[PDB]
Amino acid sequence: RTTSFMKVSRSKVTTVVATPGQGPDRPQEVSYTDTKVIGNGSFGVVYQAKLCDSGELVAIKKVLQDKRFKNRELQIMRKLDHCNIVRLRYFFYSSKKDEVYLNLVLDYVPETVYRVARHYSRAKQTLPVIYVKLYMYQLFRSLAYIHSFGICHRDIKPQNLLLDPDTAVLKLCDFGSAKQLVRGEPNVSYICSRYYRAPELIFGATDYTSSIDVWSAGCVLAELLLGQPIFPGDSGVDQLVEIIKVLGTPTREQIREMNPNYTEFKFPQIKAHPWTKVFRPRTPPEAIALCSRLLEYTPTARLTPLEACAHSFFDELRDPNVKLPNGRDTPALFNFTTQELSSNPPLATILIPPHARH
Amino acid sequence: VEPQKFAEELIHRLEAVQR
Ligand SMILES: Nc1ncnc2c1ncn2[C@@H]1O[C@H](COP(=O)(O)OP(=O)(O)O)[C@@H](O)[C@H]1O
Numbered sequence A: 001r002t003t004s005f006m007k008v009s010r011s012k013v014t015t016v017v018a019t020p021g022q023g024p025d026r027p028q029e030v031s032y033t034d035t036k037v038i039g040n041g042s043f044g045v046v047y048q049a050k051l052c053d054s055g056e057l058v059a060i061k062k063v064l065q066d067k068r069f070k071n072r073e074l075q076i077m078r079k080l081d082h083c084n085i086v087r088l089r090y091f092f093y094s095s096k097k098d099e100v101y102l103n104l105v106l107d108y109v110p111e112t113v114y115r116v117a118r119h120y121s122r123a124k125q126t127l128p129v130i131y132v133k134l135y136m137y138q139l140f141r142s143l144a145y146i147h148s149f150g151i152c153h154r155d156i157k158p159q160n161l162l163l164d165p166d167t168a169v170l171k172l173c174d175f176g177s178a179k180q181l182v183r184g185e186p187n188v189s190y191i192c193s194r195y196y197r198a199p200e201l202i203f204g205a206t207d208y209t210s211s212i213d214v215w216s217a218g219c220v221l222a223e224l225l226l227g228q229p230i231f232p233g234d235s236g237v238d239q240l241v242e243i244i245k246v247l248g249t250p251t252r253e254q255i256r257e258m259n260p261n262y263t264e265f266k267f268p269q270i271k272a273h274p275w276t277k278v279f280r281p282r283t284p285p286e287a288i289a290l291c292s293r294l295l296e297y298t299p300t301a302r303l304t305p306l307e308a309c310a311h312s313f314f315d316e317l318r319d320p321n322v323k324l325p326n327g328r329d330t331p332a333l334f335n336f337t338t339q340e341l342s343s344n345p346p347l348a349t350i351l352i353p354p355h356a357r358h
Numbered sequence B: 001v002e003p004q005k006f007a008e009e010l011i012h013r014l015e016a017v018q019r
């Protein structure tokens, strides 16, 4: 759930002095019109609007600045610059009475992985594998990027994966739970949303790593393959039972890796259900393989995001003759930076195909 | 939550899907 402990002119024009997301603080007057809510929650309100100068659509995430908790969302977003992470254009502050709200002006992205998957579900179809490949690959790229700065998202789930259906570009959003993890410094365990929470988090670990994002990603993958969440359940126990019912009871050593405080309890020994029986018979073997290397009890045994990008499941995306089903070409996929590849530079031989060099 | 309390519930639940 939670983390650790303006003038109006004439359509109707709202003018504010907003600070650009990148570079040194150099605030500039920003004007926008056609404001409407495209989302509302206990966190605040999300609006769509159109910038007066360029006519470009933006999202404005308005969040209350609660001083009772640690708010790293702005601090974290400002440092991020990646093609698979939603762009922070500007931010500004505005006035619950006697309260100050933070406004994040972001690029507007019309869909999410969640809404798109819901379409296939109610249509009783499955998302074509080509999209599963495209979306998951871009997700892993975004994870490789944030992890290289030591930043863990902590809330990976389909609702936080924005999509432009025309370009098939995925952008990771919502850094309201994100944090730079430091070994030796404890974290909040009640993080990550139900269905997507790593087993070590459910066992209440406070010393977890960025590999919790990888588990969440594995859940997204499985969900896209399956047509529904793989580990549903209201409570942690409910969720862990679903996990055990697939992976089998974790061994004492796997338990120790997750949370040593549970090593001495005598858990009934449930047999693993073969991944090939979990999914439909027409599921590609390499998708199953990838999934099993993501959804591991031992956090250190999980693939890193960069390793996941290099997995054989994404081999098709490296074929020069591939295209989107709508006729268009695939988005940028091989423009890796030195930062992105820092965890494992030799992987560039796989990640950057020969036809991508030119 | 208490590891003891969490484990008891989990053990109880795993016995039911096992039996
Ligand atoms: N840049 C954006 N463009 C379009 N819609 C967005 C954008 N950012 C967020 N949304 C929508 O509004 C919701 C806002 O939630 P989010 O930004 O993920 O943080 P929180 O979950 O803390 O409210 C998202 O689930 C998403 O569907």
Ligand SMILES: [Cl-]
Pocket (backbone or CB within 6 Å): A269, A270, A271, B017, B018
């Ligand atoms: Cl069993």
Ligand SMILES: [Mg+2]
Pocket (backbone or CB within 6 Å): A159, A160, A173, A174
């Ligand atoms: Mg969100």
Ligand SMILES: [Mg+2]
Pocket (backbone or CB within 6 Å): A043, A174, A175, A176, A177
């Ligand atoms: Mg949030």
